[PDB]
Amino acid sequence: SGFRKMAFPSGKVEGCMVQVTCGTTTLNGLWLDDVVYCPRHVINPNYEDLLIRKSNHNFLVQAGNVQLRVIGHSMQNCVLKLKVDTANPKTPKYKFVRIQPGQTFSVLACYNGSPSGVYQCAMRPNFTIKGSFLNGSCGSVGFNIDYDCVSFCYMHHMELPTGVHAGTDLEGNFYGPFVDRQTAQAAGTDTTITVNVLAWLYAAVINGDRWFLNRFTTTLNDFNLVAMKYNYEPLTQDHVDILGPLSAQTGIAVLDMCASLKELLQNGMNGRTILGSALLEDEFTPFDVVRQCSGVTF
Amino acid sequence: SGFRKMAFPSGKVEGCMVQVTCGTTTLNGLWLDDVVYCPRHVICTSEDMLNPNYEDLLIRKSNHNFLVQAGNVQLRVIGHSMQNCVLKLKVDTANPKTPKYKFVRIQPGQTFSVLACYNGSPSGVYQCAMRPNFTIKGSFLNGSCGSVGFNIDYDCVSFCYMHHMELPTGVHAGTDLEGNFYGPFVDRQTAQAAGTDTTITVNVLAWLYAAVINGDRWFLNRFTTTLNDFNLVAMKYNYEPLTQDHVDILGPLSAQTGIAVLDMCASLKELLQNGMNGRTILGSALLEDEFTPFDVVRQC
Ligand SMILES: CC(=O)Nc1ccc(N(Cc2cccc(Cl)c2)C(=O)Cc2cncc3ccccc23)cn1
Ligand SMILES: CC(=O)Nc1ccc(N(Cc2cccc(Cl)c2)C(=O)Cc2cncc3ccccc23)cn1
Ligand SMILES: [Cl-]
């Protein structure tokens, strides 16, 4: 029993964290094989022009107490790729994935190439992450683990004026309408990830919390009309299908849980809590709930 | 900026997780040097659950009764001993991934990261606090026994918990790495109930200082209070008493935010009296008590 925000074991990623120094700037790099990936801001910035002026010895890559010698440098979007003479002997089975809003991942927050903490995030519908990062965290990576394969999906680049965070996939493409320049940028109004709230309500039913369950069911259109009005993301047929296993396990049809959620939005908690929380949690996907309520290991 | 429940990077602990099998029972073990630590109830039968004599069950065991598996390699058990509720299985191979480590017994209110394992395989990492009633509100299924709680201070892993059991309310009970249970619990199927849980007041205050550091000020007020008056209000809400040690420990956050401890205490008094009024503090609609003063300073 119990439900916790749970991050993937960060070990496979910790063995990849290196420190990247370019002049006065020091941030984190992801060392996979003989390549170190880091935010290109480490170098109104014309990055292509700044990078051609750089030489290999300008970059100092430090992996623990060993300095790696940079033998090449190239830029892929907002990410810098520093070729090194040494392949990372701790390189796990990995792949680069671009996630969609609503999807969750573990963040390994690093400072000076040293892992300091691990936490579970969701890519907000406005393409920001509500992370916890201080200056020096740039280059910290977001990942998931599938069997024994690390899926790298995020690299930290910046903090927006509201305290939310913005970054890219491992191909340097930003999540959202953000740029890596010192310019006025604001995240769009955030919305609730409806499919993740429903997944979390199924987790509460699995943990014995049933007070919110009602006799009612709704049409998907009627639910979306109500949810849209409360700044909740629309629920698609894909979301209903993905919630199928939890619906089968708890005996609560997806549109049955939607009618419970419909009431929760129009009326509130009435002083009650679900899984120890007084707000509807949206940073647990349907797969996260299945994994935690079934004991899948990595 | 931002505030998250943050666990320690679990890598140094993952390299120690092994599977321990004794007959039909399979749980997790912590492999440090040439010793594997695990809950002693791995030696229990279906008959020896309500009132097992572990000393008597262990003397009947031989080294070949324990199967220790570290990845796809079986470790040879060359000795077995019991230290309180933990079993220590001596192996003929020192763990080459053994980090700098130490065994620490924590106090209620203290936080630690839990690496939940099944069959010696790490499945997830989360953050916990030792509740004032000596239970942990973990996330554990059957097979998680032997999962460990830890903190990391520069290169060194402080092991502070090993998971043993789930109480009838869904809360979890376990021991330090010397086998001494946290709380009035025993590793038997006997009727056991956790005491009524209370809020870790010092951690709530620490979390309110984190909210001020992050720009949240709506809950602040012009009032101060005496420590005794605060404790009288706090107990009525099932909050732990705040001691002078707690006030002293909150000193650095008080200095950093310019809000005296007794001033923040009057803010907590008001929050307990009115509630949130539809507002949130650090994205939460309830007062969080699983961030210590030390955690808040480290994260900020
Ligand atoms: C050398 C140095 O100070 N570098 C630095 C400083 C500041 C930043 N910026 C601003 C910035 C401005 C133009 C473009 C971009 Cl992409 C980024 C960041 O956002 C980094 C950052 C990340 N996460 C949490 C943070 C908390 C406090 C302060 C900074 C944080 C980057 N590099
Ligand atoms: C073979 C088998 O089922 N083993 C088993 C079953 C039950 C238990 N007990 C009870 C018990 C009983 C005698 C002594 C002690 Cl110390 C403990 C547990 O509490 C294990 C456990 C741990 N964490 C989360 C759990 C979630 C659901 C069910 C069990 C969980 C142990 N082994
Ligand atoms: Cl699923």
XYZ file of C-alpha atoms and ligand atoms in Angstrom:
663
model
C 0.000 0.000 0.000
C 0.856 3.674 -0.262
C 1.283 6.092 -3.099
C 4.311 8.262 -3.556
C 5.718 10.481 -6.249
C 8.436 8.131 -7.338
C 11.319 8.768 -9.634
C 13.141 6.106 -11.636
C 16.360 4.814 -10.008
C 18.929 7.406 -11.226
C 22.048 5.184 -11.182
C 22.301 4.620 -14.961
C 22.119 8.428 -15.467
C 24.509 9.371 -12.591
C 27.260 7.399 -14.401
C 26.888 9.888 -17.326
C 26.994 13.215 -15.470
C 30.086 15.301 -16.182
C 31.003 18.957 -15.573
C 31.444 21.197 -18.655
C 33.386 24.459 -18.298
C 33.704 27.054 -21.052
C 35.545 30.148 -19.852
C 33.798 31.336 -16.693
C 30.598 29.256 -17.203
C 30.326 25.830 -15.590
C 27.305 23.570 -16.147
C 26.483 19.824 -16.473
C 26.993 17.525 -19.444
C 25.589 14.112 -20.342
C 28.466 11.797 -21.332
C 27.191 9.006 -23.610
C 29.765 6.981 -25.561
C 32.458 9.444 -26.813
C 30.049 12.463 -26.849
C 29.166 14.983 -24.094
C 25.818 16.768 -24.577
C 25.167 20.068 -22.767
C 23.154 23.356 -23.300
C 24.769 25.421 -26.058
C 24.450 28.565 -23.814
C 27.670 27.289 -22.054
C 29.531 29.174 -24.862
C 21.271 38.419 -28.535
C 23.675 35.427 -28.997
C 24.672 34.181 -32.486
C 25.547 30.651 -31.319
C 26.813 29.478 -34.733
C 29.235 32.456 -34.768
C 30.257 31.966 -31.103
C 30.946 28.226 -31.677
C 33.146 28.687 -34.776
C 35.386 31.016 -32.616
C 35.743 28.173 -30.052
C 38.468 25.581 -30.145
C 38.480 22.118 -28.499
C 40.770 23.208 -25.636
C 38.286 26.019 -24.683
C 36.009 23.293 -23.233
C 37.059 21.587 -20.017
C 35.117 18.380 -19.459
C 35.571 16.800 -16.052
C 34.247 13.321 -15.276
C 34.879 12.890 -11.554
C 38.552 13.640 -10.918
C 39.495 12.866 -14.558
C 39.655 15.552 -17.229
C 38.337 14.374 -20.605
C 40.078 15.799 -23.679
C 37.653 17.313 -26.175
C 38.528 16.287 -29.766
C 35.543 17.903 -31.571
C 32.531 20.187 -31.126
C 29.266 20.566 -33.002
C 25.841 22.086 -32.366
C 22.476 20.438 -32.798
C 19.800 23.043 -32.206
C 20.243 24.352 -28.579
C 22.503 21.484 -27.503
C 26.280 21.385 -27.855
C 27.938 18.023 -28.628
C 31.520 17.735 -27.425
C 33.329 14.761 -28.906
C 35.788 13.275 -26.373
C 38.706 10.811 -26.731
C 37.185 8.408 -24.185
C 33.928 6.501 -24.455
C 31.959 6.460 -21.171
C 32.477 2.956 -19.789
C 29.286 3.466 -17.728
C 27.153 4.267 -20.852
C 23.838 2.490 -20.394
C 21.453 1.201 -23.090
C 19.829 4.507 -24.067
C 17.763 6.399 -26.598
C 16.682 9.993 -27.122
C 12.942 10.538 -26.969
C 10.805 13.625 -27.270
C 7.941 13.496 -24.783
C 4.476 15.020 -25.091
C 2.752 17.295 -22.496
C 1.273 15.308 -19.638
C 4.067 12.735 -19.835
C 6.211 12.329 -16.697
C 9.964 11.770 -16.248
C 12.579 11.711 -13.523
C 14.974 14.635 -13.251
C 18.486 14.172 -11.953
C 19.438 17.657 -10.706
C 23.202 18.180 -10.903
C 25.661 20.925 -9.952
C 29.252 20.875 -11.222
C 28.645 17.471 -12.865
C 27.611 15.992 -9.508
C 24.130 14.489 -9.002
C 22.496 16.138 -5.996
C 18.864 15.033 -6.202
C 16.251 13.093 -8.119
C 12.586 14.038 -8.551
C 9.586 13.137 -10.675
C 8.268 15.852 -13.063
C 5.587 16.119 -15.653
C 5.915 18.064 -18.913
C 3.192 20.658 -18.292
C 0.642 21.265 -21.074
C 2.305 24.763 -21.478
C 5.675 22.924 -22.084
C 7.327 24.015 -18.859
C 8.364 21.828 -15.965
C 7.672 22.816 -12.380
C 11.161 21.772 -11.295
C 13.451 22.756 -8.451
C 16.651 24.089 -9.865
C 19.289 26.624 -8.762
C 21.946 28.338 -10.995
C 24.465 25.687 -12.090
C 21.741 23.051 -12.714
C 21.742 23.698 -16.546
C 22.498 20.439 -18.312
C 20.572 18.345 -15.698
C 18.622 15.649 -17.555
C 15.122 14.215 -17.580
C 14.717 10.528 -18.249
C 12.515 7.461 -18.085
C 13.592 3.811 -17.913
C 12.035 1.182 -20.148
C 13.169 -2.317 -19.101
C 17.008 -1.662 -18.919
C 17.013 1.284 -21.438
C 17.320 4.906 -20.368
C 15.093 7.184 -22.406
C 16.590 10.682 -22.221
C 13.808 13.181 -22.815
C 14.908 16.470 -21.245
C 17.897 18.706 -20.670
C 17.550 21.772 -18.444
C 18.333 25.153 -20.013
C 16.574 27.921 -18.087
C 14.162 29.305 -15.517
C 11.287 31.529 -16.561
C 10.368 34.642 -14.478
C 7.583 32.716 -12.688
C 9.967 30.087 -11.280
C 8.989 27.409 -13.837
C 11.641 25.706 -15.962
C 12.273 25.336 -19.656
C 14.544 23.041 -21.606
C 15.031 20.856 -24.659
C 14.985 17.195 -25.732
C 18.493 15.649 -26.219
C 18.400 16.818 -29.901
C 18.376 20.471 -28.655
C 14.751 21.216 -29.593
C 13.052 23.241 -26.919
C 9.871 22.063 -25.332
C 7.492 24.955 -25.900
C 7.756 28.411 -27.397
C 10.978 29.221 -25.590
C 14.397 30.384 -26.805
C 17.832 30.293 -25.094
C 18.353 34.060 -25.279
C 18.015 36.709 -22.541
C 14.675 38.043 -23.756
C 11.217 38.553 -22.206
C 9.604 35.099 -22.148
C 6.479 33.917 -20.375
C 4.900 30.510 -20.088
C 1.323 30.208 -21.324
C -1.482 29.691 -18.767
C -1.066 26.149 -17.476
C -3.825 23.557 -17.605
C -4.455 20.363 -15.603
C -3.441 17.061 -17.184
C -6.908 15.378 -17.028
C -5.687 11.870 -17.942
C -3.116 11.948 -15.135
C -5.723 13.120 -12.578
C -7.949 10.166 -13.584
C -4.956 7.803 -13.318
C -4.263 9.187 -9.820
C -7.962 8.686 -8.828
C -7.591 5.018 -9.892
C -4.484 4.816 -7.676
C -6.576 6.143 -4.759
C -9.282 3.485 -5.417
C -6.512 0.830 -5.471
C -5.221 2.227 -2.125
C -8.672 2.079 -0.458
C -9.746 5.735 -0.937
C -13.310 5.499 -2.483
C -15.242 8.475 -0.992
C -15.143 10.412 -4.278
C -16.735 7.580 -6.280
C -20.296 8.223 -7.346
C -23.029 6.245 -9.114
C -22.760 8.427 -12.208
C -21.158 8.150 -15.618
C -20.863 10.848 -18.340
C -20.362 11.154 -22.100
C -16.802 12.047 -23.155
C -18.124 15.251 -24.804
C -20.066 16.334 -21.636
C -16.988 15.684 -19.525
C -14.758 17.705 -21.908
C -17.220 20.632 -21.862
C -17.067 20.737 -18.038
C -13.285 20.090 -17.776
C -12.394 22.684 -20.482
C -14.271 25.290 -18.365
C -12.050 24.486 -15.307
C -8.731 24.759 -17.305
C -8.426 20.990 -17.666
C -7.004 19.418 -20.804
C -9.527 17.593 -23.041
C -9.687 13.840 -22.593
C -9.283 11.994 -25.904
C -10.353 8.426 -26.846
C -6.601 7.516 -26.566
C -6.667 8.610 -22.903
C -9.814 6.532 -22.247
C -8.158 3.481 -23.881
C -4.907 3.976 -21.887
C -6.978 4.087 -18.639
C -8.612 0.728 -19.629
C -6.379 -1.547 -17.486
C -7.023 0.596 -14.361
C -10.756 0.628 -15.196
C -10.654 -3.209 -15.427
C -8.641 -3.546 -12.186
C -10.885 -1.256 -10.088
C -14.295 -1.892 -11.680
C -14.714 1.862 -12.308
C -15.341 2.606 -16.030
C -13.351 5.630 -17.345
C -16.514 7.740 -17.880
C -17.591 6.621 -14.359
C -14.320 8.118 -12.940
C -14.935 11.183 -15.209
C -18.299 11.778 -13.483
C -16.523 11.547 -10.075
C -13.936 14.099 -11.405
C -16.766 16.261 -12.835
C -18.249 16.479 -9.325
C -14.837 17.061 -7.716
C -14.326 20.133 -9.962
C -17.783 21.682 -9.500
C -17.916 20.992 -5.725
C -14.395 20.432 -4.374
C -13.057 18.088 -1.712
C -15.431 19.211 1.122
C -12.514 19.145 3.589
C -11.593 15.579 2.565
C -8.325 14.376 0.947
C -7.430 11.810 -1.732
C -4.148 9.911 -1.087
C -3.262 12.514 1.591
C -3.657 15.425 -0.864
C -6.369 18.166 -0.809
C -5.824 18.952 -4.547
C -6.144 16.718 -7.597
C -2.669 15.442 -8.530
C -1.806 15.405 -12.261
C 1.851 14.283 -12.304
C 1.231 10.520 -12.379
C 0.454 9.025 -15.784
C -1.726 5.912 -16.238
C 1.483 3.891 -16.825
C 3.070 5.351 -13.668
C 0.044 4.211 -11.583
C 0.158 0.683 -13.091
C 3.939 0.425 -12.550
C 3.719 1.576 -8.872
C 0.610 -0.520 -8.069
C 2.270 -3.671 -9.661
C 5.999 -3.483 -8.686
C 7.759 -3.205 -12.098
C 11.598 -3.191 -11.553
C 14.655 -1.526 -13.324
C 13.641 28.522 -7.764
C 10.949 25.875 -7.247
C 10.387 23.376 -4.477
C 10.101 19.683 -4.986
C 10.108 16.604 -2.824
C 13.548 15.453 -3.811
C 15.176 12.134 -3.167
C 18.930 11.517 -3.120
C 20.439 10.103 -6.334
C 20.014 6.339 -5.730
C 22.978 5.041 -7.803
C 25.297 4.303 -4.867
C 22.479 2.259 -3.227
C 21.352 0.461 -6.457
C 24.845 -1.043 -6.712
C 24.191 -2.781 -3.345
C 20.744 -4.290 -3.977
C 20.733 -8.085 -4.141
C 17.982 -10.718 -3.958
C 17.947 -13.013 -0.882
C 16.045 -16.311 -1.079
C 15.480 -18.652 1.843
C 13.228 -21.561 0.890
C 10.097 -20.074 -0.699
C 10.657 -16.504 0.610
C 12.438 -14.016 -1.616
C 13.213 -10.463 -0.446
C 15.922 -7.792 -0.926
C 19.353 -7.587 0.659
C 21.869 -4.774 1.031
C 25.303 -6.018 -0.112
C 28.066 -3.965 1.530
C 31.623 -5.335 1.405
C 31.413 -9.141 1.985
C 28.129 -8.904 4.010
C 24.478 -8.971 2.837
C 21.990 -7.406 5.284
C 18.299 -8.310 5.036
C 15.201 -8.653 7.340
C 15.603 -11.714 9.557
C 11.970 -12.728 8.737
C 13.348 -14.154 5.435
C 13.996 -17.335 7.544
C 10.277 -17.572 8.581
C 7.923 -20.405 7.662
C 4.042 -20.223 7.487
C 3.940 -21.657 11.109
C 6.591 -19.245 12.453
C 4.909 -15.923 11.732
C 2.781 -15.216 14.820
C 5.508 -16.167 17.338
C 8.789 -17.096 15.656
C 11.913 -17.871 17.673
C 14.432 -16.400 15.200
C 17.510 -17.508 17.168
C 16.163 -21.105 17.064
C 15.168 -20.860 13.361
C 18.634 -19.479 12.398
C 20.648 -22.191 14.203
C 18.664 -24.785 12.085
C 19.806 -22.946 8.912
C 22.961 -23.702 7.006
C 24.842 -21.418 4.539
C 23.470 -23.423 1.578
C 19.874 -22.593 2.606
C 20.384 -18.919 1.559
C 20.574 -18.057 -2.128
C 21.999 -14.586 -2.704
C 21.723 -13.284 -6.251
C 23.493 -10.100 -7.344
C 22.305 -9.492 -10.893
C 22.867 -12.685 -12.869
C 25.605 -13.874 -10.454
C 24.887 -16.120 -7.480
C 26.933 -15.181 -4.408
C 28.212 -17.953 -2.146
C 27.082 -17.557 1.482
C 29.993 -18.483 3.792
C 28.440 -17.402 7.136
C 25.248 -16.169 8.804
C 24.587 -14.191 11.954
C 21.741 -12.172 13.412
C 21.895 -8.656 14.767
C 18.520 -7.866 16.283
C 15.895 -8.103 13.426
C 18.465 -8.118 10.595
C 20.215 -11.112 9.196
C 23.857 -10.720 8.100
C 24.920 -13.154 5.400
C 28.678 -13.275 4.947
C 29.564 -13.838 1.262
C 32.789 -14.887 -0.511
C 32.810 -11.742 -2.684
C 33.110 -8.125 -1.554
C 30.750 -5.781 -3.432
C 32.992 -3.902 -5.875
C 30.303 -1.184 -6.016
C 30.365 -0.669 -2.172
C 30.173 3.069 -1.596
C 31.551 5.066 1.353
C 28.810 4.303 3.896
C 27.739 4.350 7.505
C 24.787 3.103 9.515
C 22.800 5.827 11.238
C 19.718 5.650 13.433
C 17.414 8.585 12.644
C 14.917 10.396 14.914
C 11.208 11.147 14.118
C 10.858 14.061 11.744
C 14.049 13.096 9.877
C 13.757 12.515 6.157
C 15.425 9.944 3.892
C 15.182 8.539 0.396
C 13.742 5.070 -0.082
C 14.907 2.807 -2.893
C 11.968 0.413 -3.351
C 13.170 -2.959 -4.680
C 11.565 -6.249 -5.722
C 13.666 -9.384 -6.264
C 16.855 -7.371 -5.643
C 15.944 -4.967 -8.461
C 15.484 -1.226 -7.830
C 12.090 -0.140 -9.131
C 11.705 3.379 -7.730
C 13.099 6.095 -5.502
C 11.008 8.339 -3.254
C 11.318 10.675 -0.275
C 10.089 9.796 3.218
C 10.066 11.101 6.727
C 10.226 8.991 9.915
C 6.775 9.829 11.330
C 6.533 10.916 14.993
C 4.751 7.508 15.615
C 7.895 5.730 14.152
C 6.205 4.521 10.983
C 6.919 5.596 7.425
C 4.212 6.422 4.913
C 5.913 4.436 2.160
C 4.827 2.919 -1.110
C 5.536 -0.732 -0.824
C 4.039 -3.957 -2.202
C 4.810 -7.511 -0.934
C 8.407 -8.383 -1.912
C 9.726 -4.907 -1.006
C 11.088 -6.226 2.358
C 14.757 -5.338 2.583
C 14.318 -2.040 0.613
C 16.527 0.596 2.260
C 16.213 4.184 3.437
C 19.253 6.388 3.058
C 20.680 9.894 2.949
C 23.890 10.968 1.184
C 26.392 13.495 2.579
C 29.141 14.126 -0.045
C 30.156 10.699 -1.475
C 28.917 8.883 1.678
C 25.695 6.932 2.014
C 24.020 6.989 5.399
C 21.809 3.905 5.637
C 19.064 4.617 8.144
C 16.223 2.252 7.326
C 15.430 -1.250 6.138
C 11.822 -2.092 5.333
C 10.330 -5.042 7.287
C 6.522 -4.796 7.420
C 3.236 -3.069 6.603
C 0.874 -2.270 9.467
C -2.939 -2.751 9.090
C -3.419 0.934 8.199
C -1.113 0.799 5.168
C 1.816 2.488 6.973
C 5.237 0.832 7.070
C 7.559 -0.279 9.830
C 11.201 -1.255 9.777
C 14.584 -1.105 11.453
C 17.899 0.741 11.288
C 20.731 -1.305 9.636
C 21.624 -2.733 13.110
C 18.183 -4.479 13.182
C 16.608 -2.254 15.848
C 13.053 -1.417 14.973
C 11.878 2.134 14.782
C 8.964 2.288 17.191
C 7.133 -0.238 19.340
C 6.986 -2.795 16.545
C 8.111 -6.433 16.352
C 8.724 -8.623 13.299
C 5.831 -11.018 14.108
C 2.246 -11.249 12.729
C 0.936 -10.297 16.233
C -1.691 -7.517 16.553
C 0.219 -4.267 16.032
C -1.063 -0.742 15.613
C 0.757 2.508 15.025
C 0.078 5.293 17.526
C -1.974 8.302 16.302
C 0.290 10.210 13.935
C 1.128 13.877 14.456
C 2.494 16.646 12.213
C 6.225 17.339 12.172
C 5.855 21.014 13.223
C 9.534 21.924 12.708
C 9.355 20.562 9.159
C 6.132 22.529 8.456
C 7.895 25.726 9.639
C 10.964 24.823 7.542
C 8.640 24.347 4.531
C 6.969 27.768 5.187
C 10.476 29.340 5.128
C 11.058 27.533 1.763
C 7.784 29.085 0.523
C 8.952 32.581 1.573
C 12.290 31.973 -0.160
C 10.299 30.981 -3.297
C 8.165 34.173 -3.210
C 5.081 32.915 -1.378
C 4.166 35.411 1.342
C 0.330 35.360 1.510
C 0.240 33.349 4.793
C 2.586 35.804 6.592
C 1.197 37.997 9.369
C 2.240 40.898 11.654
C 1.955 38.611 14.729
C 4.550 36.871 16.854
C 3.774 34.339 19.656
C 5.344 32.803 22.758
C 6.691 29.267 22.240
C 4.278 27.970 24.925
C 1.215 29.688 23.312
C 2.210 28.249 19.929
C 2.560 24.740 21.426
C -0.877 24.996 23.078
C -2.473 25.871 19.696
C -0.323 23.344 17.747
C -1.302 20.304 19.955
C -4.974 21.024 19.371
C -4.261 20.344 15.648
C -2.212 17.163 16.361
C 1.053 18.989 15.743
C 4.233 17.971 17.588
C 5.440 20.424 20.261
C 8.148 22.787 19.074
C 11.175 22.669 21.374
C 13.946 25.284 21.832
C 16.153 22.932 19.690
C 13.663 23.300 16.817
C 13.671 27.122 17.187
C 17.505 27.110 17.137
C 17.595 24.802 14.067
C 15.235 27.218 12.225
C 17.665 30.109 12.993
C 19.485 30.118 9.598
C 16.149 30.247 7.684
C 14.937 32.981 10.075
C 18.161 34.939 9.316
C 17.851 34.370 5.536
C 14.180 35.465 5.291
C 14.127 38.148 8.022
C 11.186 36.433 9.714
C 11.821 35.401 13.313
C 10.848 31.788 14.277
C 8.156 32.971 16.675
C 6.785 35.242 13.878
C 6.592 32.285 11.459
C 4.954 30.333 14.339
C 2.167 32.915 14.502
C 1.733 32.493 10.697
C 1.375 28.687 11.225
C -1.139 29.355 14.100
C -3.286 31.417 11.658
C -3.053 28.829 8.840
C -4.325 26.166 11.303
C -7.152 28.481 12.425
C -8.424 29.592 8.925
C -7.157 27.000 6.503
C -5.878 27.901 3.034
C -8.966 29.779 1.739
C -8.569 28.132 -1.689
C -4.906 29.213 -1.866
C -1.809 26.969 -2.021
C 1.696 27.158 -0.578
C 4.408 25.861 -2.959
C 1.691 24.181 -5.087
C 0.248 22.295 -2.089
C -3.169 22.846 -0.424
C -1.998 21.161 2.859
C 0.931 21.979 5.150
C 3.885 19.774 4.168
C 5.906 18.187 6.992
C 8.366 15.922 5.105
C 11.055 18.563 4.485
C 13.391 19.184 7.358
C 15.195 22.449 8.049
C 18.423 20.861 6.635
C 16.533 19.750 3.425
C 15.141 23.263 2.877
C 18.558 24.898 3.269
C 20.175 22.273 0.976
C 17.513 22.588 -1.755
C 17.443 26.435 -1.560
C 27.595 31.854 -16.045
C 26.160 32.041 -15.643
O 25.843 32.676 -14.636
N 25.255 31.443 -16.463
C 23.855 31.539 -16.439
C 23.130 32.336 -15.536
C 21.752 32.331 -15.631
C 21.132 31.549 -16.599
N 19.709 31.503 -16.698
C 19.043 32.623 -17.373
C 19.157 32.570 -18.877
C 19.315 33.734 -19.619
C 19.365 33.693 -21.004
C 19.246 32.485 -21.672
C 19.085 31.334 -20.931
Cl 18.825 29.823 -21.754
C 19.058 31.355 -19.549
C 18.954 30.481 -16.209
O 17.739 30.466 -16.334
C 19.677 29.356 -15.488
C 18.879 28.741 -14.356
C 18.288 27.497 -14.475
N 17.553 26.896 -13.529
C 17.377 27.544 -12.384
C 17.915 28.823 -12.107
C 17.707 29.511 -10.886
C 18.258 30.744 -10.683
C 19.039 31.340 -11.665
C 19.259 30.711 -12.856
C 18.697 29.435 -13.124
C 21.926 30.789 -17.454
N 23.265 30.781 -17.379
C 5.167 -15.287 1.440
C 4.591 -13.967 1.859
O 3.476 -13.595 1.486
N 5.387 -13.228 2.678
C 5.020 -12.179 3.533
C 3.689 -11.762 3.659
C 3.417 -10.722 4.524
C 4.451 -10.126 5.231
N 4.213 -8.914 5.945
C 3.601 -9.026 7.271
C 4.534 -9.594 8.311
C 4.264 -10.814 8.914
C 5.140 -11.358 9.840
C 6.303 -10.684 10.179
C 6.561 -9.470 9.580
Cl 8.007 -8.601 10.007
C 5.700 -8.919 8.652
C 4.443 -7.673 5.427
O 4.057 -6.660 5.993
C 5.186 -7.584 4.104
C 4.921 -6.296 3.351
C 5.827 -5.252 3.353
N 5.645 -4.068 2.753
C 4.511 -3.885 2.087
C 3.492 -4.860 1.978
C 2.279 -4.647 1.274
C 1.322 -5.620 1.230
C 1.527 -6.842 1.862
C 2.684 -7.088 2.545
C 3.707 -6.104 2.631
C 5.747 -10.600 5.048
N 6.032 -11.610 4.213
Cl -1.524 1.220 -19.116
